[PDB]
Design a protein around this nucleic acid. Sequence first.
RNA 1: AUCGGCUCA
DNA 2: ACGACTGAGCCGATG
Lengths: 49, 49, 75, 100, 961
Amino acid sequence: KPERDGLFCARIFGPVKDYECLCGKYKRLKHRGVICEKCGVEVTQTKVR
Amino acid sequence: TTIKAAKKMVEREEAVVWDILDEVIREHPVLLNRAPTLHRLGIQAFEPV
Amino acid sequence: ARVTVQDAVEKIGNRFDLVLVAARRARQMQVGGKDPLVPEENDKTTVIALREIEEGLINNQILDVRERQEQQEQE
Amino acid sequence: GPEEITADIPNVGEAALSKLDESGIVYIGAEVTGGDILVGKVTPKGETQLTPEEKLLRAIFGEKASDVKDSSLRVPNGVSGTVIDVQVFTRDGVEKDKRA
Amino acid sequence: PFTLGQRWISDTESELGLGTVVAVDARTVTLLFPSTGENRLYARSDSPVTRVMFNPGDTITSHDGWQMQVEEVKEENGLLTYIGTRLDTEESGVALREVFLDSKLVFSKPQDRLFAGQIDRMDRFALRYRARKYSSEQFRMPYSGLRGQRTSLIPHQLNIAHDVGRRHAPRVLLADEVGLGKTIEAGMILHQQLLSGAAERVLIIVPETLQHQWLVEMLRRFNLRFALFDDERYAEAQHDAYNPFDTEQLVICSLDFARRSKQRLEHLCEAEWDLLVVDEAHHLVWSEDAPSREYQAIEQLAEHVPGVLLLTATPEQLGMESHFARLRLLDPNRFHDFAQFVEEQKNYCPVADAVAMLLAGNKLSNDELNMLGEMIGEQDIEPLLQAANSDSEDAQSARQELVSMLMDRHGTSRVLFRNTRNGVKGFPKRELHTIKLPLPTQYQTAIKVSGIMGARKSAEDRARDMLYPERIYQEFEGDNATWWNFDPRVEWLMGYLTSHRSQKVLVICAKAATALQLEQVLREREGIRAAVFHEGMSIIERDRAAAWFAEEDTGAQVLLCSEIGSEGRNFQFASHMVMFDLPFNPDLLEQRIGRLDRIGQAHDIQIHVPYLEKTAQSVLVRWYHEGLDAFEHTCPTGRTIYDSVYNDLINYLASPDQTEGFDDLIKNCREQHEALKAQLEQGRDRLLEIHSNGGEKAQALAESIEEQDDDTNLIAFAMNLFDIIGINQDDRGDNMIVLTPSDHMLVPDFPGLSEDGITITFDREVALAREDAQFITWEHPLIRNGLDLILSGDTGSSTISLLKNKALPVGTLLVELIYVVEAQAPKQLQLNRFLPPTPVRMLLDKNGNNLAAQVEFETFNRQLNAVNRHTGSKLVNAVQQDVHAILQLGEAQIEKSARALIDAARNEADEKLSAELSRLEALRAVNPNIRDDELTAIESNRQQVMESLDQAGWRLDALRL
RNA sequence: AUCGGCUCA
DNA sequence: ACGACTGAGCCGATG
Ligand SMILES: [Zn+2]
């Protein structure tokens, strides 16, 4: 898992899957652009990376 | 009735498959290539059978 | 047109506008049905666009004037 | 979770479980075309669960939980007649397969 | 990960509020509703509770003065923090946590959402309409609940379903004998109870050994989600929330689980239950002045349970009819004392004997005018003339209207349901094949050694060997497995097998190990597409084999061994055969058969058996066929011969090849049997059996339901419904079909994780056992989602006013005005089977609403705004007074088109509820089993319904222009 | 995937 | 003072 503030990180570049996070509350699709926090992901399709 | 159902009739080597193939290759040409393509005739089209 | 298209090239004129006069015509007879004029000898919509040029028919002058016809029939 | 090599897919069976005899691997000299299966290998994809009411449900069946996906060693999509013999390098710490 | 500060509502209890969580130890959750002021305790895992949170662009309704939304939904390890816009004076960056939400739900209201942001697709609103369309059309659907199950379509199972499902108070004595599957047909009702409404909470009593089967279906017959209860889960549910177990609704326990501990009983009772379901394979009797230990537990159960079933207590075997006990259960009102009842039973012998019908009695004398009477001696009037009627070409006439004087007249039928193999007319016949093979010199040289080492006391050991030679060889001889190439039951395997691979067959052998050898053998050494069906292996093998055994024709052959029961997995296609081991015992022999002898088992059955002359097996073949024809005819009298010839048959088996003084037994057993067959044609009380199978009345139920599985718009709609939500449709080679839940797009509360095997065809599914698709399966989730989320096909755009389409461009801007007629009440008084939420079209331009052609025929002739931001919702600025000028007038045409289907729903309510009420006010006169708590439910339902009909209103959720 | 090795047009 | 063929095969070994 791409660390917190590391060269790899979702709280910057987006999550490791489609519309999901790191930690694991927001899943599949529903939350289109839901600006999360605990994992830290603006829930978008990972291709942002 | 679907694309996937046809994915079995193709792999099964069912006879009707090759039937359609003859009328698909009918009026549908091909590109044929040899390296090095030093000029332009290195590629030409030939209506296959 | 399977062997040699020499008659239908110089009708429109050149070989590049044997494409965009036949591409446009190969498009029209693939989507919304459209008429097969010169006997559909089995064949497919590929040859047909060109085959209409081999019997004194399809041209750029006949594809930009008859598209005004389908803009005088839907009122 | 450590990978495994016996016949335990939740997808492909019992169709291609008669190429393989049982307990691990392709029986010596088994005629296999491209696509069919040899040694049955299968990997866990995480998800590791431990919730209350779902332990018994998955317990009363055979087991299926923290494991596994179609991760077998397959015949290459190419001509691959049949077998001659099967070599085995089980790890030092025993836990030895049966067909081995 | 239940964290404190959440806001769960409830699945079947959303009349309380938006519940705040207040406790977690290890397995439970406690709620808090500040509006109603009360708690609701649930589990963490199997918990009827839903997640309520909104999306970006939406709003939250707070609790003081201001509220609004929305930026970004902020979790903190569990607790969300709605940082939501304030409407009172502008501000940009306002915090309103979810723990501080409202307890009520004043909604978005699809009217005022027009003036916000970007909208949802012109390609999903069309599958919203459909959702509310079929919901409106199915629930007022022609037949209640009995739509999809793991059955085949067959009258007598459904006649019991159709009947007791209409009973407010289900109080039935389910009796049907062995083999038929009394429990599966019997549930029939349990399932159909749910969906109409008036029951949750079904306690099912069953001795612990027999839960497995009972848990699975349950779920795979009617998908009955079950959390069992034992000392392993009682101890969980104890600390859980404390008190009685309101933890889950559906549950199974034994009355072993009730009795054992003597406060448990008090806990089982005060649970506000609904139905009590009990089954038993061995009895519960009680002699007078001396009642039974384990029985006296249920007394206090039944009396305080309102609805009750019982899969018989176990008479079926013997005594014919000593039933006062199992009837003392259901109604202590109409059975004062038993010293009487007997009389009822002593008198009804002649009538059914004399019932004969027009078949076995034809015409009968002035003992028919007499009585028949008794019941209609005092009622009089009509049948004087119509009683004598017996002949004179009207062959179906008087018969079908007189049997309702009766049947209706039985004092014990109304409750009871007893079906056997004559009243019902569904079985396939039995064509036995007899083979006789040549013996080997290996089994000879052996068995003449058995005598020398043979000679101990007891009874059973001498009898077992000789008679058995296949696995009487891998114990005492030398080598274990060698008989492979030897005996001719293996040479037969080929010659028979070697050309008859085309069809599929069913073979039953001795036990496991014996058939583990065959597999090694045949699969390979001969070379067949063979698989294993033993007893030890995990469920999935039994799916895997069955599945592979049922495929179009690629897994030809299975090797049944040991015993099965009467499995709820019919192999409706396996109509061919080879008998293998002729056990020694008719009952275990009648399970070998048990699968292939039932209605579903279509096409005629080919029984094949093989034996070696001189062998034990030699003798039984004739004893079964030629003694009491067990092959060609069903026979549960096979037993009480074996247990009277017992020691007089073993003598002859023991030493097989000797005494010719033997074919007397065969023809004494073809004596004691033969006459008992007609003894029990004069034990059948028919009318209860004609009351319990149906006929002309039951012939229909199936046939007009057989149309309603042939649905080619459920193969589409359904795939096209969850595909959109975010569950893709893969693998269609089989009649379905693998649904994986997709990234696009889903909410966490689905059951399906990875791989959901399924199909959408009754009689094709039945062979295997891997889940079904029909308008009552996995849809209680998917229905809700098409409608109860709202924001999903809510309001979209399309071809409107543009100059690009013709021939009236100007503007003429049309708008969809759908309206619900939310019947304001809960399900128990079944408002939902006469008026459910319903749609209506409404495309108006100032004038009244239009409807000419289909929306289905113009849904592929509409063009949505396929545009992001700078040209997306660009009519959303200067079109707020434009459209709503057709809303002040648009809300003029909703009372007329709705109150027309309302008055046309009451005149079906007070045209059927008051009509059905005559069927119960009047049958009181016949006075079969009925007490004053079924009529006054409909007379307290009627005046709760035309009080349900005066209240309904409206709610929008549609827009496409 | 970068590098190294080696064949045939 | 600079500039380094056009195709794909098979094996091998470490960021
Ligand atoms: Zn997160």
